[PDB]
Design a protein around this ligand. Structure first.
Ligand code: DGT
Ligand code: CA
Ligand code: CA
Ligand code: CA
Length: 341
DNA sequence: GGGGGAAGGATTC
DNA sequence: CACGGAATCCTTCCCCC
């Protein structure tokens, strides 16, 4: 099997440069301003001129202007990035039918057919790299390997804007050398539970009795790591379909008053229905982020679609169920719609 | 002992 | 001080073969 992985570099920031070329070369930071105060918010991402100094996705904007006071700080523009992404995804459909769009800027191309070996695949990468760069002025990193996880690992290793092929030969040396933490799907939490069991490398998952492993990280992830270890992992490339849709806004002041939160909740519902773009949801979830950033939610599934009024009246109930069952103050509030008819 | 759903939470990118 | 959107899992609970 030959799976090619494409990943747009520092995407949001790089799109911002495309829409305004005079930004090339300068440190750029795409932000999400909460409106809780002067420059309150977080960093969605930044180009590399700013990533070298520590600025990066996740960190606050206040903590970012301390390091790079003169960087260009732009507000996030989802809508736009969504379009640009889509245009680029449609260019990839030109190279294969078996394509999986894993996120706004990840994509896996299945080319087991149209290729014989990695050298006949390497060129295919450049044909795509130097094609998106041309049609859309956007730079990307290509990862090539026997399967998805390794196609993905390849890309991680060649960024920014590059291309690395990981063939059957090397895959074997990585199942040994490679640090388990850098394996797609092993966050800081899973990466720790594993050190605790002496599994610092992919190959070490064979020296532990499965059951002891199924208790520590759940069965799904256990079979997962193992498959990779015994080099027999080969998940197909299916077309993932949207299952839920939502919006979570941040409030100006962390509160608990029902009438103070309702407005935000509604504004979230309005946008949620807009995005629903003529899709009827059977399930509604009211999610909230407590004062200590813990995420709490309550929801309900109906036996029929949820009209907008239903949505309004039902979300106010699920909310009270949170302010009741929980006592902490609420920072961010939002909704999620799922189980589409 | 299941199937099978639903609900609330964990964890990853 | 740290936004935002969605997917896959896990555990528990429930009704009832
Ligand atoms: N709002 C928000 N968006 C994020 C966050 N992290 C990642 N994203 C979004 C914006 C990124 O452009 C997009 C896709 O790429 P990544 O997620 O890989 O970020 P980036 O483009 O820097 O990837 P790269 O490190 O270059 O491989 O995901 C985050 O913490 N908050
Ligand atoms: Ca990226
Ligand atoms: Ca990525
Ligand atoms: Ca990792």
């Amino acid at each position: 099997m030959i799976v090619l992985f494409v990943d747009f570099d520092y995407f949001y920031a790089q799109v911002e440069e495309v829409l305004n070329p005079s930004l090339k070369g300068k440190p750029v930071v795409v932000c999400v301003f909460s409106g809780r105060f002067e420059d309150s918010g977080a960093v969605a991402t930044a180009n590399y001129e700013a990533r070298k100094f520590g600025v990066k996705a996740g960190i606050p904007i206040v903590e970012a202007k301390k390091i790079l006071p003169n960087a260009v700080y732009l507000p996030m523009r989802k809508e736009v990035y969504q379009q640009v992404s889509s245009r680029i995804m449609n260019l990839l459909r030109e190279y294969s039918e078996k394509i999986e769009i894993a996120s706004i800027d990840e994509a896996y191309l299945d080319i087991s057919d149209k290729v014989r070996d990695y050298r006949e695949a390497y060129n295919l990468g450049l044909e795509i790299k130097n094609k998106i760069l041309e049609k859309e002025k956007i730079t990307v990193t290509v990862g090539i390997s026997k399967n998805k996880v390794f196609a993905k690992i390849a890309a991680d290793m060649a960024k920014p804007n590059g291309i690395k092929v990981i063939d059957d030969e090397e895959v074997k040396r990585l199942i040994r050398e490679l640090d388990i933490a850098d394996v797609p799907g092993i966050g800081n939490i899973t990466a720790e539970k594993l050190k605790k069991l002496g599994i610092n490398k992919l190959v070490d998952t064979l020296s532990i009795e499965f059951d002891k492993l199924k208790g520590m990280i759940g069965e799904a992830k256990a079979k997962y790591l193992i498959s990779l270890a015994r080099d027999e992992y080969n998940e197909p490339i299916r077309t993932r379909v949207r299952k839920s849709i939502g919006r979570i806004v941040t409030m100006k002041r962390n509160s608990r008053n029902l009438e103070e939160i309702k407005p935000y909740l509604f504004r979230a519902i309005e946008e949620s229905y807009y995005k629903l773009d003529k899709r009827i949801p059977k399930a509604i979830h009211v999610v909230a982020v407590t004062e200590d950033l813990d995420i709490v939610s309550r929801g309900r599934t109906f036996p029929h679609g949820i009209s907008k009024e239903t949505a309004y009246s039902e979300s106010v109930k699920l909310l009270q169920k949170i302010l009741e069952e929980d006592e902490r103050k609420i920072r961010r509030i939002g909704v999620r719609f799922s189980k589409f008819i």
